[PDB]
Each structure stands twice: as C-alpha cells, then as structure tokens.
C-alpha cells in the first residue's frame, strides 16, 4: 500500500543516551546491512519529512525513450550500378551503450516495448535535382520469416508481418510491442550454452556461444524507401527510440564499470582502468 | 581481444575443482588455437564491474577474527520455472580475499578452504538416456 | 518455430520390438503410415509470414 509518491518516514526527536543498547555496533559478516537513522547515533529534533521517492521507482527510471539503433537506407538513380540500400537490423538493446547499462542493473526483466521512429533524409550528390516526399516501410520480420533479399521482392507484401508506412515530414513513428519473451522473464545475462557437446559427437557439432540463448531472439526489422528510383540520390537515416514500459525487474547486479565489448560480458584491454588517482588523506 | 564470448564449454564448466580469479588481464594471442577460457579479473568481479559493488548479491564475509564459516541458502533463480541444467548454470559462488592473509611475522602462511554444498528441493523432468558430456 | 538449439525438441523414434511375422504365401514386406496432430493444450503465437511460398518477379 505504500506508493511511490509517499512522504518518507519522519525524523523523530531523540535526546541524550547512556544505555546497554548498541545501535552503533554491528557485524558485516552476517551479510546484513545495519539499519540505522540519524537519531540512532546523534541527538535529533523532530522533522516532518517532505521528500518522496516518487521518481526513483522502477517504472520511472526507464520512462525515457532511448536510441537503440540507426538504420540507413537510400534511394539511388535508376541507371546506377549499386543496388538501392535497404537495411536489416537484428533487434537488440545491446548495440548502443546507454540503455543497455540501465537494463543491466538487474538480472531479469519484463516490459511492454515501445519503439519510436525518427527518420531524416538528405541528398548526397552535388546537383540541384528533386525528390518528392519519401515514404518508408518498416517491416518487422519475426524469427524464421522470409527476410527480403531485394528492395522490390515478394517479401514486402507483408500479409502477416506488422509494418508501418511512414510518410516523411509527419510526426515520428510509433508502435507497441508487448512482453514477447519465450521465457518467464527476459534474460540480460545467460550463463550457459545453447548446445551440449556430447562425447559421441564431434566437438564442432556440439559447440556454441557463451552467453547466448537463441541467435534469433526477437527478429529483424527491415526498412526500405517505398518510392521508386529517382534521378537524384537521396539517403535516409531512421533512428529507433525504445522506451520500456510496464517494467519489472529481478535481482540487482553491479553496474558495468568498464566499457562494453561485444554483446557479451567480456572486456577489452586498454579500458581496464575506471577509477582515477586520489590520495588517501586528501579531501 | 579478438573473439568475444569465445570460452569453450570445457572451460566454462570446471566441475568440482572449479576456477580462480586473476590479478591481471592477459589477452590470449594464439589465434592458431585459442585457449578459450575465462580470464576473470578479480577487481572487476570477473565481469566488468567494480568488486566493491559485489555486496548487492546475497553474501557473507568470513573475517577470521570473528567467524569461521559462510552459509548461503539459495533458492532456484532463473527466467524459467525449470531449465536444462546441463546447458545452464543458475548460481555462481565467488570467493575473493577482501583482506589478504596474514599470520604472525611469517612469510608463507597457509590455511584451507572447504566447500560443502547441498542441493535442495530438486526436481527433474523428461527422463531419457544418460548424457555423457564432452568435459575434456 | 525454427531450428534452434535453445528451443530444441528432442527425438521421435520407431524400433522393432519383436519382429514382423507372416505365414506362407504372404507379402513379406508392407507399409506403415504416420499421422501427426496437435492436442487440446496446443497453441501458437506471434503471427508471421511463411516461407513455404513465394512470388519471383
């Protein structure tokens, strides 16, 4: 019943003391933190506490949208040699640093996921040519579904896939995705392997990655310019912003101290130094 | 420093003999045949985070002058109700000396550490033929 | 719904318990037909596009 926006426990006025009770003495061998408050050690007056923990609630701590990835696509001229650039990105929070570390404060989580799409385009070649306002399809390809090989192949029919046709210039795109995990919680860290190396099998056949569950965990997004070739080249950058809503978490873990290296927990050399120089007897 | 998440199963599961932490990170350079093991830096708690924060995990600190043992009852913790034990490890028991060992005015003191663990409320499903894993 | 180690399913096998016995003047070899079906407790989620069909150009 104690909500987030509740006033914190008050400070009780306590006077001088000379008794056989020892708030001050403990033993951190027990693993337990000694739970004291100012009054326990020094004389205090009465204080009606006003501050609340309101903002520090798990839900509020993740209430911000965050850039997960930057997908780049383009629409070149018809005569061109290179193909029209259409991107495919494996949906994961671990491509960027910020949001990841925040999510790493715990062992597991559940959250309905909100994605936002900020598209931004421009020309590239020195020319005064023209491009009419461009549209963009963002097709979510769940694991196993046919990944588009061309920018104009059958896959874009999306008879079952959930897509979003964004018209450039209008407000950023947004879609809601519930907790879609195969487990009873999303796993930030997975101490194990997908395969088991059997003895009646060759090492190769039984080998897999350390820390990985399913290579394809959530699927890929596919983004393409819908409008056809235009004599003047136009490149586009779609920025995805994720805001984890309705979030729950379990078992806290120490926050990442050294820079990330790969999708794993691994650390690169040359970054193994986080704390600076400070003399013990210097304030 | 070339291959992330590359530790092989055989090095990931060192059984009852277990493993250790190191005082320095030394990259594996033999790309002809990698050593594929964990190099768990002590101060980084072996996972890129400052040891001093290791207390967020359930724990006890055996401080010689006081106690002589550490007892940590652990419940099953995972993302699933039941999971493949062969493939995945639920818990981790890390022991690192917060204060180095010192005895008298001696140069080489030695005292042993013994771990006794007892599985509790264990349940297993899907009975089949026995798995003979390639541990070596 | 794809080949994955993490979500592997196991193995279905059929072996001769005894053997097949037939008297004289009888076809010594015959056939067995297999069927599969989900059960009342089965379900499917996260709708997606199939690969078992395509339109080339």
């Amino acid at each position: 019943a104690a909500t987030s926006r509740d006033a914190l426990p008050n400070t009780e006025a306590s006077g001088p003391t000379h008794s056989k009770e020892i708030p001050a003495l403990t033993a951190v061998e027990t693993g337990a933190t000694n739970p004291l408050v100012p009054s326990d050690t020094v004389q205090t007056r009465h204080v009606v506490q006003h501050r609340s923990r309101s903002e520090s609630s798990i839900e509020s701590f993740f209430a911000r949208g965050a850039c997960v990835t930057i997908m780049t696509v383009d629409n070149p001229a018809s005569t061109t040699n290179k193909d029209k650039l259409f991107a495919v990105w494996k949906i994961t929070y671990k491509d960027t640093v910020q949001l990841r570390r925040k999510l790493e404060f715990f062992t597991y989580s559940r959250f309905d996921m909100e994605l936002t799409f900020v598209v931004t385009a421009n020309f590239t070649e020195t020319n005064n040519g023209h491009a009419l306002n461009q549209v963009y399809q963002i097709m979510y390809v769940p694991p196993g579904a046919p990944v588009p090989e061309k920018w104009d192949d059958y896959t874009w029919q999306t008879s079952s896939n959930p897509s979003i046709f964004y018209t450039y210039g209008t407000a950023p795109a947004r879609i809601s995705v519930p907790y879609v995990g195969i487990s009873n919680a999303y796993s930030h860290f997975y101490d194990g392997f997908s395969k088991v190396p059997l003895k009646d099998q060759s090492a190769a056949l039984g080998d897999s990655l350390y820390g990985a569950a399913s290579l394809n965990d959530f699927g890929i997004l596919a983004v393409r310019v819908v409008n056809d070739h235009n004599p003047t080249k136009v490149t586009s950058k779609i920025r995805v912003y994720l805001k984890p809503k309705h979030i729950r978490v379990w078992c806290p873990r120490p926050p990442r101290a050294v820079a990330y290296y790969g999708p794993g927990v691994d650390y690169k050399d040359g970054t193994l130094t986080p704390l600076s120089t400070k003399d013990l007897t210097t304030y | 420093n070339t291959t992330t998440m590359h530790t092989s199963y055989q090095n990931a599961n060192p059984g009852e003999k277990g493993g250790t932490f190191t005082g320095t990170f030394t990259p594996d350079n033999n790309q002809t045949s990698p050593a594929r093991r964990f190099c768990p830096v002590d101060y980084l708690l072996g996972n890129g985070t400052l040891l001093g924060n290791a207390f967020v995990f359930p724990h006890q600190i055996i401080n010689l002058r006081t106690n002589n043992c550490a007892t940590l009852v652990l419940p099953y913790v995972n993302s699933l109700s039941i999971d493949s034990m062969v493939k995945h490890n639920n818990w981790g028991i890390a022991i690192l000396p917060l204060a180095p060992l010192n005895f008298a005015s001696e140069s080489s003191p030695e005292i042993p550490i013994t771990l006794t663990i007892a599985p509790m409320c264990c349940e297993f499903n899907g009975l089949r033929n026995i798995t003979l894993p390639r541990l070596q | 719904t794809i080949d994955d180690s993490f979500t592997e399913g196991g193995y279905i096998s059929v072996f001769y318990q005894t053997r097949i016995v037939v008297p004289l003047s009888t076809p010594r070899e015959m056939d067995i037909l297999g069927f599969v079906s989900a059960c009342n407790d089965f379900s499917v989620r996260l709708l997606r596009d199939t690969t078992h069909i395509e339109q080339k150009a």
Partner: nanobody, 120 residues
C-alpha cells in the same frame, strides 16, 4: 541487404584445388561465426566448416578434414575456402553461410551458391 555472394567456380579434374570465396556486406555483427555448407547433387544439405567471427579458430567436417581450408580476411570482409585434393564425393554445390551461427547450425543469411565438379 547483407549481401552474401559466392565465387570460386567448379570444374576441376580429380585431385586438384579451388578457391571458394564469399563477398559479405550489410551488417555482419562480427561476433558469432561464419561458415560453409554444401547441398550435394542428391543428398541433404550438409555442414562443411565453420570459422569464428574474426578468430581463426575453426573446425572441419569429418568428410573434408584437412582437405578443405576455411579462413577469413575481415579487412576485406571476406571468407575463403581453399580446397585441396578434390574428389568424386566433393562434387557438389557450395554455400557461404556466414551469419549469426554461434555454433554450426543457425542462420539468417545464406548465399546463392555455386557448383563444383570434380571430374574423372
């Protein structure tokens, strides 16, 4: 648009050698593996060999052991399959399956493949 395009041909005499290459693009998130697969004329698709992300740690198929060599050049973002001692069993199509992996089986990107023929 992770474009995997094989090359290397396939029309050698029995016993020779060929260099099977594969140009990779798009976003190959290094970490994982990169490999080779063969379908054969009339058999099931079979795994040939897999090499680690950037690491030169690899394995080979029992059938091909030592007679096939799979490397990489992540500077050139390519993988190579040198094949010495080609034989009548090696006559088949080869595919550069280099994406995700994590092992020697999972994929989200294949190539168009190329045929090899060891004649004699």
């Amino acid at each position: 648009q992770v474009q995997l395009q094989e090359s290397g041909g396939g029309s050698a005499q029995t016993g020779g050698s060929l260099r099977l290459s594969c140009a990779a693009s798009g976003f190959t998130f290094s970490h994982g593996y990169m490999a080779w697969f063969r379908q054969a004329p009339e058999k099931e698709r079979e795994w040939v060999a897999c090499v680690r992300t950037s690491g030169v740690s690899a394995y080979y198929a029992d059938s091909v052991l030592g007679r096939f060599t799979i490397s990489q050049d992540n500077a050139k973002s390519t993988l190579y399959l040198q094949m010495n001692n080609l034989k009548p069993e090696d006559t088949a199509m080869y595919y550069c399956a280099a994406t995700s992996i994590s092992c020697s089986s999972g994929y989200m990107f294949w190539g168009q493949g190329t045929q090899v023929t060891v004649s004699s």
